[PDB]
Structures are given as structure tokens and as C-alpha cells.
Write a protein that binds this ligand. Structure first.
Ligand SMILES: O=[N+]([O-])c1ccc(O)c([N+](=O)[O-])c1
Ligand SMILES: O=[N+]([O-])c1ccc(O)c([N+](=O)[O-])c1
Lengths: 115, 116, 116, 115
């Protein structure tokens, strides 16, 4: 799995469970086309989004559906979703972990790219 | 000024200066969209993007051009840009500060929302 | 004002008001330490902690009393406080803004350091 | 292992490897007494700091030696170290993960507490 998404909850100090995540790849005409999606597990992680074969170089967008997450918890959120937009580059063997740490009015996100 | 954008640099410990910012508003057709744009000052702030009159209720996207920022400093960062998407003015007019703290492979963003 | 502390609330999207802040400076004996203290204003800022004269070179610790903050709002947070430890003025006088963005189980902190 | 420390590097987008971490427990006289220490692994993680038996309720401080980390990379840092101070509470079965995401002039830290 060249791509993994991990989401944490900064209010409860826990994995953010059952968060919907949609990934898109930018198409030639500049539009975003659906690529992969899923919901985070009990560990706050989403594995198996794509394969090495499918995850070619290109520009990708990872949308984390934070608004629904907070709504299900009865908490008023600011953002519609969190978005992470990046270019995947074939610089030797690499795995991409996109992490996000969520609060109602703020989030942090980072990439951990390893071989 | 009901909308202000502030950007900081976590590598240098300074305001992030000359960062391009583009704001979009979702249209009736569900497309993004252009609404306003500008660049951060020497204080890392961008004021005067809009007016109370023009900044009506809607879904807005603030795109902060982080890649251009890092590349102008000779660094190859991870993200294309930082995107902040939110509904504004759904309970009447508010003042919004959208802040972002930037590193080459990471960013954080928060909003401070006040009522005049 | 060579030292300013700013605190934001990531739950409410607001300045963190009335947050107690204690600053310490490492002494010759290697103990912390008292140096200055105060509380954030309605803007979430704490100015006037010290003067250019008193704020000499040294190792400083800014302790932000986050637990007291969250408990006064009826929340049980993870951390006792947020601690920011840094050497100041080692290359001559600078102006320091120490910022912290607070959530019940998390915080971020950054410094903006400028030269007058 | 009731306590794990994880450190990430926001400049390189990688685990922060070989970072020294010192844990202290607050003693009756209010002083901090050494409790456990180690260095993060290639995954940026530090496991095996303590046992269930030893990790009783109390106030703990986790010091992450960020200054030396940045110095070894030739990068000028702001902080002497990052410090995380918290009370451990016996509210049923719990594991504490203290995470920190490091930049030269900033860091974020969060707790993930799970059963
Ligand atoms: O996964 N993490 O450990 C972790 C910690 C702090 C963070 O701020 C983030 N982040 O920005 O996504 C991730
Ligand atoms: O505005 N600030 O001072 C400030 C501090 C820390 C932060 O993490 C952020 N942020 O996420 O945008 C902003």
C-alpha cells in the first residue's frame, strides 16, 4: 500500500474513527476524478486505498470529511472538510502516509514519506 | 475587513511574506467561482480581500499557495497548496481570521471567528 | 515589549482569554527562577511581561496554564500546562512572540522572532 | 507498554529518528525524578519505556530533545526541547501515546489514549 491515511481527534485524544475519506487524481482537463475512498478504522487508519500499479505520478487530493465527523459527535465544526493536495513523485521506493490531527476549528496535517 | 488571512513560517519563525492567496465561493451551479485574491504583507497578513457587502453567506475556499512560497525560498515542499473550506455568515455577518502555520511537509490552520 | 504571549482556542475558534502565564529564567545554580507572569486579555494576548532592560540573555521557560483554562470551561484536558523553553537574546536583543493553539488533548506552539 | 512516544519531522516529512526522550515522575517534594528514557527508532517510535506495574497514577513529564535533533541536521532550532506534562489516571484500561510533530520554530503535540 503506497498510500495510507491516518486521522486523530484532538478533543477526545483518540483515533478519529469512521471518518469518510475521498481521494481524487487530477485529470488532463484539470478536473478532479474519483480515485479511491473509504472510512477510517477503529485505529483511525485507512489502508488499502490503492496499489503500487495504480498509484502513478500525478497530482492527488485527499478530502477528509471532518464536518460529518464533528456533527456525529454533537460538536459544531468550522470546516466543510480537510483537504490535502500533493504531487506523487517516483523518487525511488516510497510510501505516503497522510496524517491529520482534528479540532473543531483547526487541523494540522503532515506527510510521512518513507522507503 | 470581515476576512483576514495570516500565514506564518515554522522553519524561520517569521511571518510568511508574499504568499499568494486565492479565495473562491461556491456558485449556484456548484462550481468554485473566483471571489478575491492577494498576497501577504511583511507582517504575513492579508487584509482588504473583501467588504461586508460582498462577503455574503456561502461556502468559501481559501487557497494558500504554499508550494510557490517554499520554491521561491529554494525548498521542495510536499503540498501543492493549503486549502481551507468553510461556510461563512450562515448565522449573520462574522469576522473571520484564517491562519496557517507552514512547514515543508506539514501545515496547521485555524480560524478565529468573532462577532461585531 | 520584547516578549508577547498569544493563546488561541481550537475548540471555539476564538482567542483564549484569561489564561494564566508564568515565565521563568534559568539561574546560575541551574534552577528555574521566577521572571514574570500575567494573564491573556480578551484578545488572547499578554503584553508587558518584561522590558528590554530586564529581558537579558538566558534560558527562559513560558508555562501556559492550559489545565486551569479548560477546567474553568468545564472540560477535563490531558496536559497540566504547555511549556515553551528557549534561549533568548543570545545574538543580541530580539522581539519574541510565543503563540499556542489549544485543544483538550493537544496543543501546538510556534515562535515569531523579529529584530528591531 | 502503557506508554509510547512517537516523533515526526515536519521539515523532511519523515519519522524523527534517534531523538533522545527523557521521562520524569513528579516526587512528593515536587521535584522531577528520572523515570525512563531512550531514543526513537527508525520509525520515530520509542517503545518499552515502562511496564503496567511501574506506571502508576501520578504526574509525568516527557522531554523530547529537539534541539540536538535539529543540530545534528545542521538546522537552527528555537526550543531547547519539547515538554509534555500530564497526569496519568487509572480510568479503566488505557495506553498513552504521546506524539509530537517537529519544526525548527514550532511543534505540535497530542495524546492518543486508548483501551
Ligand atoms: O500522526 N501523528 O502522530 C500526528 C501528530 C501531530 C500532528 O499534528 C499530526 N498531523 O498534523 O497530522 C499527526
Ligand atoms: O496564529 N497563530 O499564532 C497560530 C499559532 C499556531 C498555529 O498552529 C496556528 N495555525 O494552525 O494556523 C496559528
Amino acid at each position: 500500500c503506497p498510500l495510507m491515511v491516518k486521522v486523530l481527534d484532538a478533543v477526545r485524544g483518540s483515533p478519529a474513527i469512521n471518518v469518510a475519506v475521498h481521494v481524487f487524481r487530477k485529470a488532463a482537463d484539470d478536473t478532479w476524478e474519483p480515485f479511491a475512498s473509504g472510512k477510517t478504522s477503529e485505529s483511525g487508519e485507512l489502508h488499502g486505498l490503492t496499489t503500487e500499479e495504480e498509484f502513478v505520478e500525478g497530482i492527488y487530493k485527499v478530502e477528509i470529511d471532518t464536518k460529518s465527523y464533528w456533527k456525529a459527535l454533537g460538536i459544531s465544526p468550522f470546516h466543510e472538510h480537510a483537504e490535502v493536495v500533493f504531487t506523487a513523485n517516483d523518487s525511488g521506493p516510497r510510501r505516503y502516509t497522510i496524517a491529520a490531527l482534528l479540532s473543531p476549528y483547526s487541523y494540522s496535517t503532515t506527510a510521512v514519506v518513507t522507503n
